[PDB]
Design a protein around this ligand. Structure first.
Ligand SMILES: O=C(NCCc1ccncc1)c1ccccc1F
Ligand SMILES: O=C(NCCc1ccncc1)c1ccccc1F
Ligand SMILES: [Zn+2]
Ligand SMILES: [Zn+2]
Ligand SMILES: [Zn+2]
Length: 459
């Protein structure tokens, strides 16, 4: 049970307004044939154009909401909308393009999908709320066949060119005119009552319905993300490395140890309340502090209410010492906090657009994160960059330019001249810091935090 059987039944009720008379009894095999495609009993890696929910979730990076609305059907112009906000008008002769024939529309589709997906995935998964026109329009821009490799590289082929009779991946498809071996899923097969807008609007207020095909395409993909990542959560599913995943996670671990160690040295809290990850380890193992853990899984729908996390009767007194919220998203942080909050607004290959302002952050696992809210941090301040070290000034073992920095909190800098070891360590740490920030993470600390209190730890 790996792929979706072509002999699986497809409910056609949602298709009968564009396609009147459609048989109630329908398989994927018959539907694909009706869409104008011939599979020829091919055992060559492409068993079905349609995929399961499980296969769709594994390939969330490939998701592109797609909707087709009749502007006037072989005789009428069609408006093709994509969750990228693009609207193309195909004539059979929020970006809105005027009517053009299919031979030019298909070139634009290949360019748009290649630019959106080359750094995300090896495929495209068209996420539909199928009514008919979108399925019958696929023959105009899609070619199918056996699984192939790119003409210029080892990646699988996602595009085809009728000019050169060649196949290309998303990175080498310039000038290509056909989408090759796409995948698709119809959200209406999941069992919903009512139309797209009524189901989407139950969980999201950020996407509106301007009555254009891209609006519906956006709502469709948002609803699919809500069903698969918000109301249902599977953190076991692994996702491939496509960018700076390893460096970001390593930087996150370096920054957490640095910031927590310095906060304990500067304000000598007798107790730390570590709220979040049920699998958390002490990030500063040598610290004197009483380390107490509280379990909370990552919230994917709304941010946790601090009243529910802390009250209803543990040290009980969270007000004593400091609270560490490392990627634990709460509505309003207490004043005595050390916080790392992922900013859902960040533009990156890891962060996909999500539901109701939130974003789907995909790094080893998929985490739908609730919308970033600046008010969550009213009792805190932004944590400034600093590097702290009490390790001995000793090189051991990359050329050098002398480091001068007020934020290099070391015994050598206190003594008036940064040593080579602490300069190399400072520069490596600043790189890890910038990587973590640029990835979308934001750091916040209790208002009394002052790095001036770290200089007296060298006496
Ligand atoms: O937002 C991004 N990617 C679009 C994903 C997407 C869009 C529309 N419909 C489905 C999926 C992005 C932004 C900045 C950098 C890299 C990115 F990948
Ligand atoms: O949930 C995340 N990370 C798994 C460990 C974890 C942390 C905190 N609370 C529970 C669990 C996570 C979510 C969004 C962005 C970055 C992340 F690291
Ligand atoms: Zn290639
Ligand atoms: Zn939405
Ligand atoms: Zn030094």
């Amino acid at each position: 049970p790996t792929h979706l059987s072509v002999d699986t039944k497809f409910k056609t009720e949602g298709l009968c307004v564009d396609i009147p008379g459609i048989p109630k009894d329908m398989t994927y095999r018959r539907l694909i044939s009706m869409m104008g495609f011939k599979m020829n009993y091919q055992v060559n890696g492409y068993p079905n154009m349609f995929i399961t929910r499980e296969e769709a979730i594994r390939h969330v990076r490939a998701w592109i909401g797609f909707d087709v609305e009749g502007c006037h059907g072989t005789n009428l112009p069609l408006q093709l909308g994509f969750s990228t906000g693009v609207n193309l008008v195909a004539v059979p002769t929020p970006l809105m393009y005027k009517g053009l024939p299919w031979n030019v529309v298909r070139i634009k589709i290949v360019q748009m999908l290649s630019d959106t997906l080359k750094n995300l995935s090896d495929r495209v998964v068209f996420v539909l709320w199928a009514h008919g026109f979108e399925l019958t329009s696929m023959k105009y821009f899609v070619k199918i066949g056996p699984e192939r490799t790119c003409c210029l590289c080892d990646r699988r082929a996602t595009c085809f060119s009728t000019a050169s009779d060649t196949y290309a991946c998303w990175h080498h498809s310039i000038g290509f005119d056909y989408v090759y071996n796409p995948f698709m899923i119809d959200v209406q097969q999941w069992g919903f009552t009512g139309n797209l807008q009524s189901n989407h609007d139950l969980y999201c207020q950020v996407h509106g319905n301007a009555h254009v095909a891209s609006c519906d395409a956006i709502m469709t993909r948002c609803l699919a993300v809500h069903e698969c990542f918000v109301k249902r959560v599977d953190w076991t599913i692994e996702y491939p490395i496509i960018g700076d995943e390893l460096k970001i996670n390593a930087a996150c671990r370096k920054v957490q140890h640095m910031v927590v160690k310095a906060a304990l040295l500067a304000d000598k809290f007798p107790v730390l309340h570590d709220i979040g990850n049920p699998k958390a380890i002490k990030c500063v193992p040598q610290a004197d502090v009483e380390w107490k853990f509280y379990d909370a899984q990552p919230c994917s729908d709304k941010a946790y209410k601090i009243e529910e996390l802390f009250y209803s009767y543990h040290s009980d007194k969270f007000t004593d010492g400091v609270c560490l919220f490392w990627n634990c998203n709460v509505d309003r942080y207490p004043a005595n906090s050390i916080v790392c909050r992922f900013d859902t607004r960040v533009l990156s290959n890891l962060n996909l657009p999500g539901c109701d302002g939130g974003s789907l952050y995909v790094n080893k696992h998929a985490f739908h994160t609730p919308a970033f809210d600046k008010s969550a941090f009213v009792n805190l301040k932004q944590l400034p960059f600093f590097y702290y070290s009490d390790s001995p000034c000793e090189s051991h073992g990359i050329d050098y330019v002398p480091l001068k920095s007020a934020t290099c909190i070391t015994r050598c800098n206190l003594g008036g001249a940064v040593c080579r070891h602490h300069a190399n360590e400072y520069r490596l740490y600043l790189d890890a810091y910038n990587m973590m920030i640029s990835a979308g993470f934001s750091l916040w600390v209790y208002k009394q935090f002052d790095t001036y209190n770290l200089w007296n730890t060298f006496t």
